[PDB]
């Protein structure tokens, strides 16, 4: 049985997530701007749907036939605790709990980012402990368990260097 973690894939300047054998999601700003193929498939044959910082790829053949299709939703109810599935180039896996809030345009460092706001639940500092996000983590998925079903509801877009606030980019 393939774990959720096998779906998290290094991509461009960050990461993305296999929803099904043909559907891959990522953060718009990590996608290469010079490319003729992705994952060995010509761009000719890839449908790209971009909505702000959320991008969905639909391939015309099965790239990951080992996977079953997962539920993808447009964000989650306010107050849902998601996990952000962060992979690091050390080989570390860092699932971090995030309390999700409203859809909003928020001021994060310099910039306006639109998506579902969240607050990390790992406490005061990261302190140099594995407890917060870094810039290279963009495109990591937000997931939660609902009855028996895993749900993916967006991708990591931005975070304040001051610890607390993250933005999850969502579909549509």
Ligand X SMILES: CNCc1cccc(Cl)c1
Residue 128 sits in the site that holds a second copy (CB under 8 A): yes
Residue 79's binding partner among a second copy, ligand X, none (Cβ under 5 to 8 angstroms by kind) is: ligand X
Tally Cβ neighbours within 10 Å of residue 18: 24
Is 114 catalytic? The answer is no
Residue 145 sits in the site that holds a second copy (CB under 8 A): yes
Which is nearer to ligand X, 81 or 134 (by Cβ)?
A: 81
Is 29 catalytic? The answer is yes
Residue 77's binding partner among ligand X, a second copy, none (Cβ under 5 to 8 angstroms by kind) is: none
57's CB contacts (< 8 A; 6+ apart) are 23, 24, 25, 26, 38, 46, 47, 48
Residue 110's binding partner among ligand X, a second copy, none (Cβ under 5 to 8 angstroms by kind) is: none
Spatial distance between the Cα atoms of 24 and 18, rounded to a whole number of angstroms: 5
From the list 76, 82, 138, 168, the catalytic residue is 138
Which has the closest alpha carbon to 67: 24, 20, 100, 27? 20
Which has the closest alpha carbon to 169: 159, 92, 160, 122? 159
Scan for tokens 């809030």, then name that residue. 101
Minimum gap (Å) between residue 164 Cβ and a second copy: 14
Minimum gap (Å) between residue 97 Cβ and a second copy: 5
Is 138 catalytic? The answer is yes
Residues that bind ligand X (CB under 6 A): 79, 81, 99, 121
C-alpha distances in angstroms, 45 versus 30, 48, 50?
20, 10, 16
Q: Where along the sequence are the contacts to a second copy (CB under 8 A)?
A: 3-5, 81-83, 90-97, 121-123, 127-131, 144-145
- The catalytic site residues sit at 29, 53, 138
């Amino acid at each position: 049985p393939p774990t959720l973690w096998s779906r998290v894939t290094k991509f461009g300047s960050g990461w993305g997530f296999w929803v099904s054998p043909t559907v891959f999601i990522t953060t718009t700003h990590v996608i290469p701007t010079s490319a003729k193929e992705f994952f060995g498939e010509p761009l000719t044959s890839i449908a790209i749907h971009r909505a702000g910082e959320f991008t969905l790829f639909r391939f015309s053949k099965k790239i990951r036939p080992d996977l079953t299709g997962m539920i993808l939703e447009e964000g989650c109810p306010e107050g849902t605790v998601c996990s952000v599935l962060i992979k690091r180039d050390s080989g570390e896996l860092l699932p971090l709990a995030v309390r999700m809030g409203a859809i909003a345009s928020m001021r994060i460092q310099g910039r306006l980012v639109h998506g579902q706001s969240g607050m990390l639940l790992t406490g005061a500092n990261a302190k140099g402990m594995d407890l917060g996000t870094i810039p290279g983590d963009c495109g990591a998925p937000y997931v939660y368990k609902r009855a028996n079903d895993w749900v993916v509801c967006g991708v990591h877009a931005a975070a304040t260097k001051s610890g607390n606030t993250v933005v999850c980019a969502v579909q549509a």
